[PDB]
Structures are given as C-alpha cells and as structure tokens.
C-alpha cells in the first residue's frame, strides 16, 4: 500500500484510550524540535491540512536537560494556562539552544516578561495547582505512550509519525509528506 505501518508511522501495540486526536510531544532543547518549529513549522502545516473538528495538543517532556528541562515543562504548562503560546515558543527554542542566555528559571521568566506577560500575572501562574494540574496532563500524557524520544507526534492515541521514513532531501516535500501522513491517519 501508499501508507504501510512501519513506514510512515508505526502502530502502537499498546493503544491509548482517550488520548487527543493529535498530540505532539518536544523538549525546547531537542535539535529536531527547533527545525520542526523554527524551518519547517510542522504543527502549522499539520493543521492546514487536518478536518473540520479535530484539536491539536502540544506538551513538553522532561527528560532532556534535567533541572531546567522540568522548569521549562511548567513553564510551557504557564504558557497553555495563560495562552501565550505563540508568543514565547521562539524566544524559548532560541533562548535555549540559539544565544544559550537560559540557564536558570529566572532566565525562562524574563522570557515572559519581554514577551509582555506581566511578572505578576506570570508568578501566580507559575505557583497555580491549575498549572500542578497542567503538569501533570504533559507527564501522564507522555508516560501512557512510554516516551523515550521527541519530536513525536501520535494519532488519537494509537498511531505514531515516523518522519525517518520520508524523504529529506526537500524541506517542503517533506514537511507535506508528514501532514498527509498525519491527515491520512486521522481519517483512519
């Protein structure tokens, strides 16, 4: 077939009831990640291509970058709280892995700050149970599919991309393979 499990996606063996219909998982210190935001706009193309009444869900994993890696899950966790997704997703990735001027929570906060969010309105989601709560989804969301890797994008918890199996030899072509992908599955 065009679309063959194993090729462009694997299937899980253990499905995830429940889960979002298109849950991607990254880390703002994974290489690929950046590319995936930054050159390629992945999630972006994904939703141009996806149906009338399906959710994108986006969490940050911990288990790059230990201490700051976990700051920034509830950092993001701020971010979906508060909306502000779109505005600090770059200045994060380049932060971390461009100029490196984030090394501590404080440094993620100024982040915030100079995105316009207030340090007030900031702190208070920072130490909310509404964000506990928010950092708990990220985590149990990425233990149900026992995740050891990202970028990962996986399909109503039962279908995982598998972009090593697309060509790369053209950033477009490559970024329109995925988003098919991700639409052919969806109406799996």
């Given at each position: 077939a065009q679309y063959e499990d194993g090729k462009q996606y694997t299937t899980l063996e253990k499905p995830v009831a429940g889960a979002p219909q298109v849950l991607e998982f990254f880390s703002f210190f994974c290489p690929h990640c950046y590319q995936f935001e930054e050159v390629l706009h992945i999630s972006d193309n994904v939703k141009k291509k996806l149906p009338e009444g399906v959710k994108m869900t986006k969490y940050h994993v911990?288990?790059?970058?230990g201490d700051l890696g976990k700051d920034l899950t509830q950092a993001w966790a701020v971010a979906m709280a508060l909306g502000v997704e779109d505005k600090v997703t770059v200045p994060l990735f380049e932060g971390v892995?461009?100029?490196?001027?984030?090394?501590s929570a404080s440094d993620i906060r100024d982040v915030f700050i100079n995105a316009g969010i207030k340090g007030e309105e900031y702190d208070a989601a920072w130490n909310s149970f509404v964000v506990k709560s928010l950092v708990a989804q990220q985590e149990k969301a990425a233990a149900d599919v026992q995740l050891?890797?990202?970028p990962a994008m996986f399909v109503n918890g039962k279908y995982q991309l598998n972009p090593?199996?697309?060509?790369?030899?053209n950033m477009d072509v490559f970024v329109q393979q995925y988003a098919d992908t991700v639409k052919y599955l969806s109406e799996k």
């Amino acid at each position: 077939a065009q679309y063959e499990d194993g090729k462009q996606y694997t299937t899980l063996e253990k499905p995830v009831a429940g889960a979002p219909q298109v849950l991607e998982f990254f880390s703002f210190f994974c290489p690929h990640c950046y590319q995936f935001e930054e050159v390629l706009h992945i999630s972006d193309n994904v939703k141009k291509k996806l149906p009338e009444g399906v959710k994108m869900t986006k969490y940050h994993v911990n288990f790059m970058g230990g201490d700051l890696g976990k700051d920034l899950t509830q950092a993001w966790a701020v971010a979906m709280a508060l909306g502000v997704e779109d505005k600090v997703t770059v200045p994060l990735f380049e932060g971390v892995q461009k100029t490196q001027t984030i090394r501590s929570a404080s440094d993620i906060r100024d982040v915030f700050i100079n995105a316009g969010i207030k340090g007030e309105e900031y702190d208070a989601a920072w130490n909310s149970f509404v964000v506990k709560s928010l950092v708990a989804q990220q985590e149990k969301a990425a233990a149900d599919v026992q995740l050891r890797g990202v970028p990962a994008m996986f399909v109503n918890g039962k279908y995982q991309l598998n972009p090593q199996g697309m060509d790369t030899s053209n950033m477009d072509v490559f970024v329109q393979q995925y988003a098919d992908t991700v639409k052919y599955l969806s109406e799996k």
